Ligand binder design. Structure first.
Ligand SMILES: [Cl-]
Ligand SMILES: [Cl-]
Ligand SMILES: [Cl-]
Ligand SMILES: [Cl-]
Ligand SMILES: [Cl-]
Ligand SMILES: [Cl-]
Ligand SMILES: [Cl-]
Ligand SMILES: [Cl-]
Ligand SMILES: [Cl-]
Ligand SMILES: [Cl-]
Ligand code: NA
Ligand code: NA
Ligand code: NA
Ligand code: NA
Ligand code: NA
Ligand code: NA
Ligand code: NA
Ligand code: NA
Lengths: 105, 105
């Protein structure tokens, strides 16, 4: 039940972006889900700060929060978008749209 | 009430590291606290994925979690630690120990 990449299919209409994104209608964004708690998994690539904070959280759970399972690497997708001239234009690498890797931070 | 760096003073004894860290006894680790919710602040440097996920969370709050306020840059501290030869040694830049910057991820 540890920090990992899971599916997350996003509809641009649902998030109000269909005003400018023509296509695609949906994409696989993924998400990072799971706990950052001891014992850790081999590949959650935990920073020292995440480790320290997790230990502090254990000792003081009402005052300090645990580390968070977040994207640590993102990948691009292509989008067809409306130009200011009102013309569909391809944005070939629209960066930061999809999770490549997750970790505790 | 947005994502930012706040104080977090860590005692190494409290987290079980006084077995190997001789000094210092405590340090300022900081932590990242606050919400990742619209409207965003100017300097939470949000990735596109964090923005998309936050919007999906709004539409589907029981199924998708919000973005997380995490460290996006860390700084070193110096520690005096016990060597395998049982001798105090300085580790001048012990990396990743203190928060330099926070953001939504
Ligand atoms: Cl562990
Ligand atoms: Cl680190
Ligand atoms: Cl491009
Ligand atoms: Cl290419
Ligand atoms: Cl881009
Ligand atoms: Cl905003
Ligand atoms: Cl981005
Ligand atoms: Cl060093
Ligand atoms: Cl130096
Ligand atoms: Cl180091
Ligand atoms: Na997957
Ligand atoms: Na959606
Ligand atoms: Na507490
Ligand atoms: Na290519
Ligand atoms: Na501060
Ligand atoms: Na402490
Ligand atoms: Na829901
Ligand atoms: Na120096």
């Amino acid at each position: 039940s540890h920090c990992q990449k899971t599916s997350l299919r996003v509809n641009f209409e649902d998030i109000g972006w269909d005003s400018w994104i023509i296509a695609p209608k949906e994409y696989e964004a993924y998400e990072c889900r799971g706990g950052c708690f001891f014992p850790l998994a081999d590949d959650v690539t935990p920073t020292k700060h995440a480790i320290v904070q997790t230990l502090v959280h254990l000792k003081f759970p009402t005052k300090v929060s645990k580390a968070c399972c977040v994207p640590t690497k993102l990948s691009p997708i292509s989008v067809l978008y409306k130009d200011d001239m009102g013309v569909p234009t391809l944005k070939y690498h629209y960066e930061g749209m999809s999770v490549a890797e997750c970790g505790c931070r």
